[PDB]
Amino acid sequence: TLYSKKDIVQQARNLAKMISETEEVDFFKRAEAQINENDKVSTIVNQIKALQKQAVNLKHYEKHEALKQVEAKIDALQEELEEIPVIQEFRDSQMEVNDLLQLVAHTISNQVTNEIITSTGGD
């Protein structure tokens, strides 16, 4: 009997659980732990939050010129955030995990095509 879509979904979840037990995701997890504890990241994320609250207010009241300044402040803070060591580590771990996922997707896609070819021969 053929695998049902339901079987495949369960098997895909099993693959994901193993993917979550790779050095890549292990890196992402400890990196994430470090940015949740870093004080500088906390200070900056809060300031950004506060400014985004003002932004919504300024646009409501159509304070365009004032909005531009708040937006400049947010851009300034976001770039500062990315300069932070633990943030750089986090971004690096994110990429490692996203690249791994893409590899899995390509592998699955390419293997399916191979299996279909070996079974049919292509059209």
Next chain:
Amino acid sequence: TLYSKKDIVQQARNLAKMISETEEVDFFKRAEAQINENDKVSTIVNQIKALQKQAVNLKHYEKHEALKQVEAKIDALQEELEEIPVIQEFRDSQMEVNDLLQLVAHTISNQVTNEIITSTGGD
């Protein structure tokens, strides 16, 4: 010990082999067999081929007006091709397989995030 990228790739290939043994891919395979044997599809695909050969020639010699006619002929034939029953079946099977693959990708992506959350808690 954590799974290595290599382990994951192998496991992804195993998932693909099972995916290739679903009703979806089984549908794609018998649909593909039918268009490779259909005479009308063969006639049209060959005519399209021949015209694409003329197209390359016309553009080389810069026969723009003439190229436009050859391109119109190709469009006419392609649409005729899609009207063919066995082709409609093939397109339907292709979608079933592509939708299944997308589901697998989403499932893997969403389960990884869940596993990371249950292990860390998110950032």
